Design brief:
The complex is a heterodimer. By secondary structure, chain A is α+β, with helices and mostly antiparallel strands. Chain A is 28% helix and 22% strand. In chain A, the strands form nine sheets. In chain A, strands 17-16-15-19-20 form a five-stranded mixed sheet, with helices on one face. Chain A has a four-stranded antiparallel sheet with strand order 9-10-11-14, with no helix packed on it. In chain A, helix 9 links the parallel strand 19 and strand 20. The N and C termini of chain A lie far apart (90 Å). Chain B has twelve helices and 15 strands. Chain B has a five-stranded mixed sheet. A three-stranded antiparallel sheet of chain B has the order 1-6-5, covered by helices on one side. The termini of chain B are far apart. The chains are: A alpha+beta, B alpha+beta. The complex binds the ligand O=C1Nc2ccc(Cl)cc2[C@@](C#CC2CC2)(C(F)(F)F)O1. The site of ligand EFZ has 19 residues of chain A, from strand 7, strand 8 and strand 9. Chain A: This is Reverse transcriptase/ribonuclease H.
Chain lengths: 543, 403
């Protein structure tokens, strides 16, 4: 079955010439097969015989397809694939089940062999030349060249999709009520028609595909739901998490632990509650992938507690365009967020989790923002719209923060949902000096070379202190300076510094950092009642 | 309906842009597919296969003056790899004009065809929700709007079309920047608006703005009756920083007042010397620094700072501290809750002035996270062009200053 669609013009990479490879010496059997095989597609029109006017060649092989003692072939286009031009990206993006709509019935039509159905570019064919070996290398070489898309060739996938995309455009317009997801050599067709009516349309489309030479399996060979889709198992009315099985075992190797955390982490998305903290600790210092590790009981408790979470599978439902989208977010740990997108409460579409490492110096609100942003995007990619958000943050809070942050930020129409823990600002710097408050003139500096330093302060109330630091850097000095001022201060303080780093860091009301010291300061700040922080030029000899 | 097409090429060695399309909302996709089927009928653009490896991002916006959607392509990458070039001049006229009105003339281009061999370089793609399908691939056959090569090639045609109005109304300035046409006159609002409607018809037959009103805002120094240790501190901080623009500024006399571990709240009187040092400074800041001249051969830069409460500040310079112009901006009525809105409005206003004054888009340094901007800027854009931009972290100092 050969296709009548127009061929895609193909060209070799800028200034390169076709493959000039050899044709491995074969056994009487291997040659016997190929000859028969070729003669088969030869009559089919798949390949044709080419004269000596073709100086190209690609190595051909013969392998007995496992399960069948019958001979099968294979052509090595590696060389060709290198010399071939680039095409557009074949995978725009993965269709996520949560994006699928609910259908009464659906059937998948595996096309597969269709490759050999799509005609190759008339002019490019010559480069697809290959030769058959004579048992003892008598005299000639029974040459052929590909006359259609070749298995394993670079272009095949790319070009097949297109063709497939075209051969479907007409049908796509006619039966809008019908859905068809294109994906590799699979054709996913779902609808809301009554089963019989559906089977009909299937055949209709099926014949349509056949109208262009595309051979597909009939009803009696079509695969039926539920469908094994990347991690998910989906039925016409719902999708389900293909329950995860954790191999219970004696000894554990490093490698094993990795793969475990792999699986485990992937599941964190769906089963929030999964933990790997202890499990991850086992890697520390690992010398070999095949090294075995003594699973700590803490890791035992955790690993077990997981096997339970991964017990109760959880189903989910599909997208209903008529319904608006609702995304809700919860704060799990520090910089650990969970969200779910549902159209009807408890009836989830998707759920994920995010873990934003300490980064540098960030805060919860910012983070939240980053999540909303991330989620927003997923949404535009899956459903084309952005969900209304239900956020654990007081409108007053959000307002106070964004109107005063230096960077442009924003959250789409969202609504406060009183579901603790709520995100809040852990402190705020006074806008002006605190009247009747001690004033600390903190300074810090360290010898970049020796890493020796002093940090200290003096106040309007005559108090003072200084400290010499070993193995430090200038910036840790400036911060330390401030830490002291915060320690020895008391509920209310005015702190002037000449440090720009700090003024920066803190003024950005961060509530978490990579730097322990900052964390220290931060804690100290939350503790205070009122803190005013001022900056002044350094080496200007001020106060 | 073709004409003899001019041959265009990419700068030597360069290859076609291959830019990934950003996910688009449903609402936008529809607008596009609709907008493109018709353009395909009309033979403007044509579907293309996979054998075309290039791509340029595409999307849709809608100006206030129109509830209908408008397609926009991001040729920034393509424009950048396109050969330069018969010419396109820039006047200093409208820079002074009383009133200028911008006209979206993009349309004209679609009349002119595009050199076969180059067309491949305009392949763009319309995405499918949840990737149900490999997006749609098109490629222009005519001059694309927003491509630097279009106003050029359509140079001839344009000049002609205009000449009448030109020397017939010479008391008017006409500038063209890509898909836009800037018209400036000192003729009072009545005549200006009517003359404009007059010119429209002239073009249609074929197929508010106020310069000077924009004066670089001087850096003002606050006046107190009494000063607190903090007040002087804040002040000295600003001047110190400002000496970078005016080396004339001195701060020693005030720094003297700050000697001692005093309480920020403590009140302090000014020595007659500090009174002078200050007064003298005030004067210096009364005018923009000497020696700042627009160097056409260098990149123009725009820096913006969120001042909050709705305000934003920005500066255009080629060399740090040698601003060509600085300004402020108060959020448009309505963007009262969303920054991105404002920032995109702000960027656009500036890019415009830029064009008006130097006929060159500034490169923007934006106070926002990339992710944020990329996610929502398209929602508020209403300009045919797209300037270059980078994201940064506003050094609080450069902020208090312009405040
Ligand atoms: O939007 C829907 N609805 C749907 C509902 C249940 C199932 Cl099991 C499958 C689908 C479907 C798909 C698909 C694979 C490509 C992902 C189909 F296209 F209909 F086949 O996409």
């Amino acid at each position: 079955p050969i296709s009548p669609i127009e061929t895609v013009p193909v060209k070799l990479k800028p200034g390169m010439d076709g493959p000039k490879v050899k044709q491995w010496p074969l056994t009487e059997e291997k040659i016997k097969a190929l000859v028969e095989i070729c003669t088969e597609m030869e009559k089919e029109g798949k390949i044709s015989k080419i004269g000596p006017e073709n100086p190209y060649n690609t190595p051909v092989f013969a392998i007995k397809k496992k399960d069948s003692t019958k001979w099968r072939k294979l052509v090595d286009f590696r060389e060709l694939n290198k010399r071939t031009q680039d095409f557009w990206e074949v995978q725009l993006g993965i269709p996520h089940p949560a994006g699928l709509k609910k259908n009464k019935s659906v059937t998948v039509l595996d096309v597969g062999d269709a490759y050999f159905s799509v005609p190759l570019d008339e002019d490019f064919r010559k480069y697809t030349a290959f030769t058959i070996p004579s048992i003892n290398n008598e005299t000639p070489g029974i040459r052929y060249q590909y006359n259609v898309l070749p298995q394993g060739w670079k272009g095949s996938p790319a070009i097949f999709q297109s063709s497939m995309t075209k051969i479907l455009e007409p049908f796509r317009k006619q039966n809008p009520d019908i859905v068809i997801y294109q994906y590799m050599d699979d054709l996913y067709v779902g609808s809301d028609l009554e089963i019989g009516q559906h089977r009909t349309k299937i055949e209709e489309l099926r014949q349509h595909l056949l109208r262009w030479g595309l051979t597909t399996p009939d009803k009696k060979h079509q695969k039926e739901p539920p469908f094994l889709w990347m991690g998910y198992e989906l039925h016409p009315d719902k999708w389900t998490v293909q329950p995860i099985v954790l191999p219970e075992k004696d000894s554990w190797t490093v490698n094993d632990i990795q793969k475990l955390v792999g699986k485990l982490n992937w599941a964190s998305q769906i089963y929030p509650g999964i933990k790997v903290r202890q499990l991850c600790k086992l890697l520390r210092g690992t010398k070999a992938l095949t090294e075995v590790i003594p699973l700590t009981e803490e890791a035992e408790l955790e690993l077990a507690e997981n096997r339970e979470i991964l017990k109760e599978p959880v189903h989910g439902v599909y997208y209903d365009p008529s319904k608006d989208l609702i995304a809700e977010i919860q704060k799990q740990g520090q910089g650990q967020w969970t969200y779910q997108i549902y159209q009807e409460p408890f009836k989830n579409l998707k759920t994920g989790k995010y873990a934003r490492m300490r980064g540098a110096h960030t805060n919860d609100v910012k983070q939240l923002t980053e999540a909303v942003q991330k989620i927003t995007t997923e949404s535009i990619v899956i459903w084309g719209k952005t969900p209304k958000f239900k956020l654990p943050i007081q409108k007053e809070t959000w307002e106070t923060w964004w109107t005063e942050y230096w960077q442009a930020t924003w959250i789409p129409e969202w609504e406060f949902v009183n579901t603790p823990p709520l995100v809040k600002l852990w402190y705020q710097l006074e806008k002006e000096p605190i009247v009747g408050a001690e004033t600390f003139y903190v300074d810090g500096a360290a010898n970049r070379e020796t890493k020796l330093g002093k940090a200290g302060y003096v106040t309007n109330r005559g108090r003072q202190k200084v400290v010499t630091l070993t193995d430090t850097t200038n910036q840790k000095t400036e911060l330390q300076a401030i830490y002291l001022a915060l320690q020895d201060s008391g509920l209310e303080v005015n702190i002037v510094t000449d440090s720009q780093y700090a003024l920066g860091i803190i003024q950005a009301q961060p509530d978490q950092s990579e730097s322990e010291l900052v964390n220290q300061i931060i804690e100290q700040l939350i503790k205070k009642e009122k803190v005013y922080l001022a900056w002044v030029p350094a080496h200007k000899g001020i106060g």
